[PDB]
Design a protein around this ligand. Structure first.
Ligand SMILES: CCCCCCCCCCCC[N+](C)(C)[O-]
Length: 619
């Protein structure tokens, strides 16, 4: 039955591979990327009219009938996202009169106007002189002076947040303004009768920081500030030292964008870092077939390549397949062999991790590494001297990254500080990088592929962590992939890989939860709403990737013979395209739970292939 489905699936993945031997599907997010880009270009005084047009097209192609934009397809209207899209559009040429503009405006005013938007949106607007700097939370460059064990120091923030803070402290230290032309002003974002509903920190705000902020703004207006210029240079140096090979900062847009702004302010437009930073941007841009242009919040080549191999190997391809060889070779060259910000917690730990993007040496993440090491373990390459060596290096790196509670985070060890989640400034997404279930689940299966079982103390502690984290209904939270279906699928398959008896009470409870959520069509869906409302747990339209995850949960749980499993396969077989791939108009990717979602273009193809391959071998 599934046989032809597999063959087509396989020949399809092979056609998507590059000549260098890697897979690289685009990463889908939301309109703010390009809205802020537009804004960025204004500040930098480097506007390409042609580029603006392709962006104008994209913003419109993305706006829904109601005149709004969401964080994910099919999601509720987002104020922040809509406000920025509105401004970019107005800067481009659109007059407030036009249909798209009007409908947007209405929504914006009904939500409390500009005063109801997040700090970032207000800040971006402040940068262009459309909102008082004094009403934006201050981040002083002096934060650069706080030491390693001292509270609130930069190393208490998650990777993503860390660079963003440093870069922003320079910007806020100067409170610059790049006035929009009179034609692009947007005072209309203020015209509202609705009281502005303000959003606090990610977990409540203390009146102290509230007081502190006012003090900071007052200190900002003093004629002199000692050691200020010193802290600025500290921040500048920090950024100079940590720039990525592609010119970006962290391989993600926020810090990159702010860093570029920071250098502009400091007359460093003729400086090497700025140049590479600016020109490096193109690599992240994507030309859309309909005449549009989009910007990637980040890029997933290493991730995509890692999974594709696993999928293709599970599909049935041999370890020595000339194509997979091309991939394993590439992967090896991608291994980081120098210390990064994680070394601040592990100075004696020898580097050997892997990063998400092409060249991001200071920020390898466990999730990538765990997958890449595992994937490498399946292959049979010419120089197994370098293969065994690379695996060994990666393996020990992962082990050394384990956190206190027995689980793994993404970038740092024990980035569990609670303090940062209370600051006024932090009202958008995760600020710390604490351990998560999924990453731990992947790390576990990685070890498992090597033969290590429950006997090993490392793995034992890990399992203890998972068991304690299991939800009441026997499900597992999906941190990076779209919820419970993702989390559960990841964990269960891992438990099986480390010699755990799937017969267990808690493991069976997980499998039941899975079956009890299957859709009529025989597939599995989970809307991104499962982050806000618990009623949406494992509830949504069926998607190839999610169906496949839940399917893995069953295959690993010894339930491949189940009825549930049979309809699952059928779904994929039926919904598959003639070319070999699957469609997926929904996001099954998670950046920040509740605030930022992702569309991993490859998921819809890779997972079903992996899931299917695993099913065939289960016979
Ligand atoms: C707010 C936009 C910044 C992008 C959010 C970061 C996306 C990169 C995430 C790296 C983690 C990916 N993964 C699967 C390996 O865990």
């Amino acid at each position: 039955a599934y046989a032809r489905t597999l063959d087509r699936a396989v020949e399809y993945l092979l056609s998507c591979q590059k000549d260098e031997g890697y897979w690289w599907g685009p990463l889908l997010s939301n309109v703010t990327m390009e809205a802020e880009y537009v804004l960025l270009c204004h500040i930098l005084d480097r506007v390409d009219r042609d580029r603006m047009e392709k962006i104008r097209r994209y913003l419109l192609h993305e706006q829904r009938e109601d005149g709004t934009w969401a964080l994910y397809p099919g999601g509720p209207p987002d104020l922040d996202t809509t406000i920025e899209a509105y401004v970019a559009l107005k800067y481009i040429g659109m007059s407030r009169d036009e249909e798209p503009m009007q409908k947007a405006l209405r929504f914006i005013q009904s939500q409390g106007g500009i005063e109801s938007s997040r700090v970032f949106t207000r800040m971006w607007l402040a940068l262009v002189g459309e909102y008082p700097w004094e009403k934006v939370p201050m981040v002083p460059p002096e934060i650069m002076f706080l030491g390693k064990r001292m509270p609130l120091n930069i190393y208490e923030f998650g990777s993503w947040a860390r660079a963003t803070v440093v870069a922003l402290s320079i910007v806020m230290s100067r409170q610059p303004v790049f006035p929009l032309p009179e034609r692009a002003r947007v005072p209309e974002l203020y015209e509202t009768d609705v009281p502005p509903r303000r959003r606090g920190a990610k977990g409540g705000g203390g009146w102290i920081f509230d007081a502190l902020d006012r003090a900071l703004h007052g200190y900002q207006k003093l004629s002199v500030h000692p050691f200020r210029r010193a802290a600025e240079i500290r921040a500048l140096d920090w950024l100079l030292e940590r720039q990525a090979g592609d010119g970006s900062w962290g391989g993600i847009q926020p810090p990159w964008f702010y860093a570029l702004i920071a250098l502009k302010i400091l007359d460093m437009t003729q400086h090497p870092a700025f140049i590479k930073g600016w020109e490096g941007l193109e690599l992240y841009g994507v030309e859309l077939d309909y005449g549009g242009w989009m910007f990637q919040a980040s890029i997933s080549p290493v991730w995509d390549t890692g999974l594709a191999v696993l999928a293709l190997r599970a599909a049935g391809l041999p370890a020595d397949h000339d194509r997979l060889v091309k991939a394993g070779e590439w992967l090896l060259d991608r291994q980081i062999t120098v210390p990064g910000d994680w070394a601040v917690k592990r100075p004696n730990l020898k580097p050997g991790g892997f990063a998400f993007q092409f060249d991001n040496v200071y920020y390898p993440d466990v999730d990538d590494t765990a997958v890449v090491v595992w994937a490498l373990n399946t292959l049979r390459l010419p120089d197994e001297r370098r293969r065994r060596d690379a695996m060994t290096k990666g393996f020990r790196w992962i082990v050394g990254m384990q956190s206190s509670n027995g689980g793994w985070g993404a970038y740092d060890v024990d980035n569990t500080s609670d303090l940062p989640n209370h600051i006024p400034f932090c009202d958008f997404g995760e600020v710390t990088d604490p351990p998560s279930e999924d990453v731990t689940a992947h790390v576990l299966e990685c070890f498992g592929s090597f033969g290590y079982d429950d006997a090993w103390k490392v793995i034992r502690r890990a399992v203890e962590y998972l068991k304690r984290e299991q939800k009441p209904d026997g499900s597992w939270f999906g941190r990076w992939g779209v919820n419970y279906l993702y989390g559960t699928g990841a964990v269960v398959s891992a438990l099986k890989a480390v010699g755990i008896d799937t017969r267990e009470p808690y493991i069976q409870k997980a499998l039941d939860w899975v079956e009890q959520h299957q859709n009529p069509d025989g597939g599995w869906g989970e809307d991104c709403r499962s982050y806000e409302d618990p009623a949406y747990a494992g509830k949504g339209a069926s998607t190839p990737s999610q169906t496949a995850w839940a399917l893995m949960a069953l295959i690993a749980g010894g339930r491949a013979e189940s009825e549930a499993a049979r309809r699952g396969v059928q779904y994929l077989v039926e919904t598959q395209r003639p070319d070999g791939g699957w469609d997926e108009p929904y996001y099954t990717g998670t950046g920040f739970p509740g605030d930022f979602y992702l569309g991993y273009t490859m998921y819809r193809h890779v997972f079903p292939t992996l899931a299917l391959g695993r099913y065939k071998q289960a016979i």
